[PDB]
Amino acid sequence: ADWGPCRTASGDPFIFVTSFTKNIQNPTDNVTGQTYPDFYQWALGDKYSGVCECPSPNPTEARPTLYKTESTLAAGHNSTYFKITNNLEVSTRVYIANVGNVQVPFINKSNSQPGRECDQPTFGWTTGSKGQLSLYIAKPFVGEQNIPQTIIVSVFGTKKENVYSSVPISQVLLSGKVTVTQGCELAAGTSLDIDFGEYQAHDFKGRTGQPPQNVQKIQKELTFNCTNISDGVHIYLSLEGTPNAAYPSAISLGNADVGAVIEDGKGNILKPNDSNSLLEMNPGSLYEYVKRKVTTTITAYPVSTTGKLPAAGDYSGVATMHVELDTTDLGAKGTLKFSLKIS
Q1: Antiparallel, parallel or unpaired: β 88-96 and 100-103
Q2: Helix/strand/coil for 111
Q3: Which of 112, 149, 233, 268 has its CA 20 to 30 A from that of 176?
């Protein structure tokens, strides 16, 4: 006997089913505060039957339906974001006819469609069927996070401002998956010239597969800033480059008789274009949840490839560093540029 709350035909809310997959491509985006606003929108084909309290089953007046939403999740980082998992938060908008996509929570939003849905349930109710979700990283995670089926919002309806039932007319069930990507980048400000300097041609004579007489070995420290790589993963350096034809352990210097070698300081040569030749780096320790600094030194020097007296000239060559995980090739991270002078 007065305008009041709406209910479904059964009394139990109608459940709308939603889901998404978010794949975060940039490793470094996996950071506290990262936000994907209004990234997923649902536009569902499901509908339900409903009826409201009214002063009689066929009242003289009509009234529009007013809608309220409430989050069914715990509070997140502000009044419109709510915790969905240990690491993720969500914010929602729900469509109300003749209003728009209204930010949850909201109250007393009118459909501006006066009616008399007061007697037997009527068909065609859709509130809940359309909405939009925003995702927020509260804490970064490694790998993937699966959001199991969870009710995230309750929709209530009424014919009387501020008078709502404790039982919603509809709810929104969400599931989904968020993934992150492993990555490493060479530290900024790292120069990649390796200048072997000058040698007399006679320094290489008769020294096949070895460095020259009076060799000045070059040492270089490499630091990679890696993200989303858990302990237990081995992280290697590998070289992409043209091997010397006579001595393939060496990188081409555009001369048949001399070449460039990179090794680990212990005589283990990192051979170019050889998928079995890998230099295991120190993977460091996680910090800021998902970051780690991965380091190695390399030792470089020219070698005689043939034992023959090389011609005087200015020689150069290149080798592109890759970082590989176990392999997964994270891609080219910088090109070493070799120079050698033979007088």
Answers
A1: antiparallel
A2: coil
A3: 233
For residue 80, give both structure tokens. 């419109």
Those residues whose C-beta lies under 8 Å from the C-beta of residue 252, and which sit 6 or more positions away, are 241, 242, 243, 244, 259, 260, 317
> In units of Å, what resolution does this entry have?
1.8
Buried/exposed code over 231-260 (b: 16+ C-beta within 10 A; e: otherwise):
eeeebbbbbbbbbbebbbbbbbbebbbbbb
| Cα→Cα distances 67→72, 89, 162, 307, Å | 16, 24, 10, 87
Experimentally determined by: X-ray
Residues paired with residue 156 on neighbouring β-strands, in sequence order = 68
**Terminal Cα-to-Cα distance of the chain (whole angstroms):** 107
Dihedral sign computed on CA atoms, order 112, 118, 119, 124:
positive
Cβ atoms of 164 and 65 within 8 Å: the answer is no
* Sheet strands (E) in 33-169: 35-43, 48-52, 66-71, 82-83, 88-96, 100-103, 106-110, 122-125, 130-137, 144-158
**Amino acid type, 226:** C
Structure tokens at 7: 């209910």
Write down the CATH number for the domain with range 183-342: 2.60.40.1090
Q: What are phi and psi of 341, to 5 degrees?
A: -115, 135
CA dist 92 and 214 (Å) reads 70
